[PDB]
C-alpha cells in the first residue's frame, strides 16, 4: 500500500524555500519558488537574493536549497525516510567544511504548509578567508554530479548523511566542500529507517534573462540507488 507520506508526493508539488544567512557577518536572505515531482526525482527552482547581492557564490548554496522529492525506486520504498516523515516534516542539520576555508552550519525545517512544501533554512558561516574562493567569488557558475550517502541513525530516530561536493574554481582547480548531516523527524510518529544507500544527483544552473535581481535557476534530478535474480 501507499503510505501517508508517499501519497503527498504522487503529483507535482509547489515548493517554497526561505533562507536567512550570515557568513563572516555578511547577512543575506534568499527566497525560492518552484515545483517538485518526486515520481521523476525532479526539482525546478528559482532563487532570489532579496537583500541585494549574494555575498557567497550561488553554487555553494545548491546543496542547502527538499530530499523528500528524490525518486525512490519501488523496490527501495521502505528506505525513503524523507517522505515517511511527512507532513509533519524533518529537521536537517549540516556542517559544510570548505577545504582550506570556512564552514557553513545549516538548520532546515522541511514540512508542508497546506499544499506547499516548505524548506526553511538558517545558515551561519564562519572562518572564511575574505579573499578565498567563497568570499572572493572564484567559483564557476556550474555544478558536477555527486552521490549522497545515507545511513540510519536508530538512536536519533533519523538518518546520518555524508558526501563531498567538488566546486570548480575559475582557475581549473576544485574547491572541496565536505558535508556532514543529520535528518530527524519533527513529529513523534513512526518513520522509515533505511538500509545504507545513496542518492545520485545531477544539477544544472542557469539564469533568467529577464531577471535583474541576483538569482539562480536550478534544475536538479535526484534518484535513490544502491539496493538491488529476476532476470
Ligand atoms: Cl555565483
Ligand atoms: Cl542531508
Curated annotation (Swiss-Prot):
Q: Which Pfam families match?
A: GFP
> What's the family?
Belongs to the GFP family.
Protein name per its UniProtKB record: Green fluorescent protein
Q: What is the effect of changing residue 143 to H?
A: In mut1.3; shifts fluorescence lifetime from 3.03 to 2.78 ns. In mut1.5; shifts fluorescence lifetime from 3.03 to 2.72 ns. In mut1.27; shifts fluorescence lifetime from 3.03 to 2.85 ns
* Outcome following mutation: residue 31 to R: In mut1.28; shifts fluorescence lifetime from 3.03 to 2.76 ns. In mut2.2; shifts fluorescence lifetime from 3.03 to 1.94 ns. In mut3.3; shifts fluorescence lifetime from 3.03 to 1.88 ns
Q: Which organism is it from?
A: Aequorea victoria
Cited function: Energy-transfer acceptor. Its role is to transduce the blue chemiluminescence of the protein aequorin into green fluorescent light by energy transfer. Fluoresces in vivo upon receiving energy from the Ca(2+)-activated photoprotein aequorin.
Tissue specificity, in the record's words, reads: Photocytes.
Q: What happens when you mutate residue 200 to F? A: In H9; increases fluorescence at 395 nm excitation
Q: Provide the alphabetized UniProt keywords.
A: Chromophore, Luminescence, Photoprotein
Q: Known post-translational modifications?
A: Contains a chromophore consisting of modified amino acid residues. Maturation of the chromophore requires nothing other than molecular oxygen.
What's the subunit arrangement here? Monomer.
- Outcome of mutating residue 173 to G, per the record? In GFPA; leads to enhanced fluorescence at 37 degrees Celsius. In Venus; leads to yellow fluorescence, improved maturation and reduced environmental sensitivity
State the Gene3D superfamilies in the record.
Green fluorescent protein
How changing residue 165 to V affects the protein? In P9; increases fluorescence at 475 nm excitation. In R10-3; matures to the red-emitting state with excitation and emission maxima at 555 and 585 nm, respectively
Effect listed in the UniProt record for changing residue 78 to R = In Azurite; shifts the excitation and emission spectra to shorter wavelengths and increases quantum yields compared to BFP
Q: What is the effect of changing residue 146 to D?
A: In Cerulean; leads to improved quantum yield, a higher extinction coefficient and is 2.5-fold brighter than ECFP
* Outcome when changing residue 143 to F: In Sapphire/H9-40; exhibits a huge Stoke's shift, with an excitation peak at 399 nm and an emission peak at 511 nm. In Azurite; shifts the excitation and emission spectra to shorter wavelengths and increases quantum yields compared to BFP
Q: Which SUPFAM superfamilies match?
A: GFP-like
What mutagenesis or variant effect is reported for residue 65 to M? In RSGFP4; increases fluorescence and shifts the major exitation peak to 489-490 nm
Effect of changing residue 67 to L: reported as:
In RSGFP4; increases fluorescence and shifts the major exitation peak to 489-490 nm
Give the gene name.
GFP
Amino acid at each position: 500500500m501507499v503510505s501517508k507520506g508517499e501519497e503527498l508526493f504522487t503529483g507535482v508539488v509547489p515548493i517554497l524555500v526561505e533562507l536567512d544567512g550570515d557568513v563572516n557577518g555578511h547577512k543575506f536572505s534568499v527566497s525560492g519558488e518552484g515545483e517538485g515531482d518526486a515520481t521523476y526525482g525532479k526539482l525546478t527552482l528559482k532563487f532570489i537574493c532579496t537583500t541585494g547581492k549574494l555575498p557567497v557564490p550561488w553554487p555553494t548554496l545548491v546543496t542547502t536549497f527538499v530530499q523528500c522529492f528524490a525518486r525512490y525506486p519501488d523496490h527501495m520504498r521502505q528506505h525513503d525516510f524523507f517522505k515517511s516523515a511527512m507532513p509533519e516534516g524533518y529537521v536537517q542539520e549540516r556542517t559544510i567544511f570548505f577545504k582550506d576555508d570556512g564552514n557553513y552550519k545549516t538548520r532546515a525545517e522541511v514540512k508542508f504548509e497546506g499544499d506547499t512544501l516548505v524548506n526553511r533554512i538558517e545558515l551561519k558561516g564562519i572562518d572564511f578567508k575574505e579573499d578565498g574562493n567563497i568570499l572572493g567569488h572564484k567559483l564557476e557558475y556550474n555544478y558536477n554530479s555527486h552521490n549522497v550517502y545515507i545511513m540510519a541513525d536508530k538512536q536519533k530516530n533519523g538518518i546520518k548523511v555524508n558526501f563531498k561536493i567538488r566546486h570548480n574554481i575559475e582557475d581549473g582547480s576544485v574547491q572541496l566542500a565536505d558535508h556532514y548531516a543529520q535528518n530527524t523527524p519533527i513529529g513523534d510518529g513512526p518513520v522509515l529507517l533505511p538500509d545504507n544507500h545513496y542518492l545520485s544527483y545531477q544539477s544544472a544552473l542557469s539564469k533568467d534573462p529577464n531577471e535583474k535581481r541576483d538569482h539562480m535557476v536550478l534544475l536538479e534530478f535526484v534518484t535513490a540507488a544502491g539496493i538491488t535474480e529476476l532476470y
